Amino acid sequence: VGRRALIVLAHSERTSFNYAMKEAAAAALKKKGWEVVESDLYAMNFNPIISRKDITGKLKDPANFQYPAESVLAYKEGHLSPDIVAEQKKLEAADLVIFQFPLQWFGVPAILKGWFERVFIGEFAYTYAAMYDKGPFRSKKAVLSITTGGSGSMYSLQGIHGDMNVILWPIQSGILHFCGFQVLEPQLTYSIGHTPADARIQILEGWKKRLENIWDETPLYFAPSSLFDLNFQAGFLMKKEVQDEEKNKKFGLSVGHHLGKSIPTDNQIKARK
């Protein structure tokens, strides 16, 4: 099970619904016996820009600086910027990780984007040899709690913005699952700006009720890595056997692995039934 949780909030105002959503989760989770630690990026005045300043010490190749390689070495030798190590320390301790934030330009705030870029250093958060389901955080579970200005109908299949499942994909699969995280259904609260005072209240109430049994929830589906030849030779492509068995299926495996066919309904919003 899980008893330790980290809530990473990306909002500057203490009056926002996002903050309200963060306080409700901490209060709910706490009541159920969890330990709740936070990362109010704004309040921490967190540095979102990856630079050679993230490595406190000597670089292996100062004249030809390559962030990936240097950052991995810095993590390995213990030369990572102190504020980065502090966050990593929180992640290593967390069983459940909540990302509370308002949708901005169809994605996460720049400060949160920068938190991933600086904290999810190779070896620590991922390894080509242990990608996705085999990643470092496979024992962990992440949830995105997002609020939007636009109504849900704008993100439905025929909504002008297009399917939300596509929007969520690059983050839930590309960032979260890539590191091994089991990603639970996203807590989506649309057009929070057009919601009656009384409903907003139930929204907080519903989120708390959900967190009461969040650890026992069924995680979203991602094609298992076993279906792929995880070697550079085969070009990390899906196994021939698997490709053949699938040629007879109506739907694709997921949003990214739609394979040219139909994408399973709410693949990134709802867990299989």
Ligand X SMILES: CC1=C(C)C(=O)C(C)=C(C)C1=O
Ligand Y SMILES: Cc1cc2nc3c(=O)[nH]c(=O)nc-3n(C[C@H](O)[C@H](O)[C@H](O)COP(=O)(O)OP(=O)(O)OC[C@H]3O[C@@H](n4cnc5c(N)ncnc54)[C@H](O)[C@@H]3O)c2cc1C
- The contact set with ligand Y (CB under 6 A) reads 11, 15-18, 20, 50, 64, 66-68, 102-106, 117, 147-150, 192-193, 200-201, 204
Going through 73-130 in order, the beta strands assigned E by DSSP cover 96-102
The answer to whether residue 206 is catalytic is no
Choosing from 155, 177, 180, 256, the catalytic residue is 155
CB 223, CB 257: distance < 8 Å: yes
Report the residue number, 193 or 209, with the smaller CB distance to its own copies.
Answer: 193
> Which residues in 208-247 contact its own copies (CB under 8 A)?
225, 228, 230, 232, 235-238, 243
- C-alpha 47/C-alpha 78 separation (Å) is 19
Q: Which of 149, 205, 236, 245: binder of ligand X (CB under 6 A)?
A: 149
Residue 188 interacting with its own copies (CB under 8 A): no
- 151 vs 48, 76, 226, 268, CA distance in Å? 29, 45, 38, 18
* Rounded least distance, CB 147 to ligand X, Å: 11
The entry of ligand X, its own copies, ligand Y, none near residue 254 (CB within 5 to 8 angstroms by kind) is its own copies
Binding of its own copies at residue 173 (CB under 8 A)? Answer: yes
Confirm whether 149 is a catalytic residue.
yes
Alpha-carbon separation of residue 265 from 80, 106, 272 (angstroms): 42, 20, 9
* Residue of 79, 161, 221, 258 marked catalytic: 161
Beta strands at 187-189 and 141-147: parallel, antiparallel or unpaired: parallel
The listed partner (ligand Y, its own copies, ligand X, none) that binds 81, CB under 5 to 8 Å by sort, is none
Q: Which of 46, 75, 99, 126 is in the footprint of ligand X by CB under 6 A?
A: 126
Active site annotation includes 161:
yes
d(CA 163, CA 185): 16
Which of 4, 79, 113, 208 binds its own copies (CB under 8 A)? It is: 113
Reported as type and span, the H/E element at residue 142 is: strand 141-147
Residues 6+ apart with CB under 8 A from 190: 147, 148, 150, 151, 152, 155
Return residues touching ligand X (CB under 6 A).
68, 122, 126, 128, 149-150, 191, 193-194
